């Protein structure tokens, strides 16, 4: 709230993109996360 | 927290809202993004 839109037309897309834009986070971000983390663990080699 | 109800029958029937409305809401947008999303990505005609 420290931010945020005033002109009607501000209001009015925020309105109509948070519909959108929620769902968007919401689904996109937790897939990024483990699409980065999910390399592999105990790869290597041993060192005589 | 630009503009909130002030008035406490406001104020209650927020309360009373929100046990019930963030649900619908969390449950059918996603819902309605989904059954909208879903079409014939491939379907065509082969124009020779």
């Known amino acids: 709230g420290d931010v945020y ?14 519909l959108g834009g929620l769902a968007m986070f919401a689904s996109y971000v937790p897939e ?7 390399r592999k663990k105990y790869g290597g080699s041993y060192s005589a």
């Open 32 to 38: 990024i996360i483990e699409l980065i983390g999910n």
């Open 5 to 18: 839109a005033k002109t009607t037309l501000g209001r009015l897309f925020m309105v109509f993109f948070i």
